[PDB]
Amino acid sequence: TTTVGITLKDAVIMATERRVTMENFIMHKNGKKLFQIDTYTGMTIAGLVGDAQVLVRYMKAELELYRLQRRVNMPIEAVATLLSNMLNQVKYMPYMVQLLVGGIDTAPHVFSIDAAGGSVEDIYASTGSGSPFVYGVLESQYSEKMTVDEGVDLVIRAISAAKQRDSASGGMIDVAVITRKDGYVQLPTDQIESRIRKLGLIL
């Protein structure tokens, strides 16, 4: 698998691929690894499928209960700290999952949480089997002065390189840009096909 999360000026862009295996044997050509976890933050999935979906359900639960009780969205450091505490309270029966939460509260953030519950900020992060390819292209092409369109084009080029060079990665890329003004919006698949045909990554 491969996930990516990129923080730029006033937005944070996250995308996954959609392929689930679950065996060697790629079984589901259209999965769901990118989840809207609250009204201004999302979570990606790059581990064991069942454990990861249970983590997504618990985090949707606790963040919605949060927003209902306190009537304000949870900060990104707070949700990643909560997620770290959950993953580290049970580490000798652990969740084999690599998480990556990202969102905006007063500044765009993306955090990366491993299976033992170590949360650490970075300006761009990635989890999954096809992670080093997207770290290569992000290291070579990333700029903090990008716009949202240049950022989502960089994200699509990244996941495309990971799909070209990795077996467990594949399928149609779903990308969701979360900004403060428009909220969590996920790009439709026709727009992503248009960006792929514009960038010349279709064959």
Binding site: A61, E62, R71
Partner: protein
Amino acid sequence: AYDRAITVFSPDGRLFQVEYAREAVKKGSTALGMKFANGVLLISDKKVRSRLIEQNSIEKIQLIDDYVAAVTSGLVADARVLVDFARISAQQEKVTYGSLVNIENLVKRVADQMQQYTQYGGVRPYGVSLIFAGIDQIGPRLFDCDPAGTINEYKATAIGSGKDAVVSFLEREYKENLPEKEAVTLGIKALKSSLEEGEELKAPEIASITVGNKYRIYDQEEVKKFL
């Protein structure tokens, strides 16, 4: 001599202590709600208090989800503990089934919780009644949960000190499937006819949902229209 313990019946066979919790509900201010053409609303009377109070925390109506909401009447301590339990049970239902599929067993969680305390000694019941309302896989829902735990699905109700007068009005005036505005004004007239003489209806909090939409609470100037 039998109305001292929660666990003792009477020569008629009555649980007075449960009925006195029901009397404790009757001291709270009136709150009503009904369903209509694709959705449900809630109306809650508030005699306007200290302007030092942040208005955010005197709302008798509370969001238990984006798609379930409720209103209380009775003890404020028990009331808040109850809306907390409703929220936590909504989250547990949502994590075990992926979504709040039907509102009914959210209210079953709340109802069984409130019922259990009407049976064991060393515990008193909750002196609060709750009116749940929302949209599920089925559609518009509207319940009331009383101190004994008893839940019933309605098309319109009230709770609180007015409850008899409001349900008396709605019992002879309510017609289903009203478009939202007309429904609200009917419910405002219902709330009006429960006050005593000389009392002027102040601004009550009112909120609604339609099928496929989320919650919204009418702000005070959208409320101010129907005065």
